[PDB]
Ligand binder design. Structure first.
Ligand SMILES: [Zn+2]
Ligand SMILES: [Zn+2]
Length: 86
């Protein structure tokens, strides 16, 4: 089933440890790859919010720049939609 999950990720010296790309259904960005830190995130997670604010209407470049600009050593929260069917 589709669940909403809050995940906390501390930005490390090498970044947050994941990559994103556009959702085929147009509801935002999905987690493309977990390059790592991002322990509660999963590939395919739809990013619905960053720091409790909705980001579904933002483009790929906008979400990326939001993460890039987030300060060194600070945490970001993400609300994600995840298919939890095993
Ligand atoms: Zn936290
Ligand atoms: Zn990109």
């Amino acid at each position: 089933s589709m669940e909403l999950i809050t995940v906390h990720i501390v930005k490390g010296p090498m970044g947050f440890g994941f990559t994103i790309a556009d959702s085929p259904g147009g509801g935002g960005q999905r987690v493309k790859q977990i390059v790592d830190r991002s322990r509660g995130l999963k590939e395919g997670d739809l990013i619905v919010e960053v720091n409790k604010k909705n980001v579904q209407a933002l483009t790929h470049n906008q979400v990326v720049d939001m993460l890039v600009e987030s300060p060194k050593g600070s945490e970001v929260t993400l609300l994600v939609q995840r298919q939890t069917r095993l």
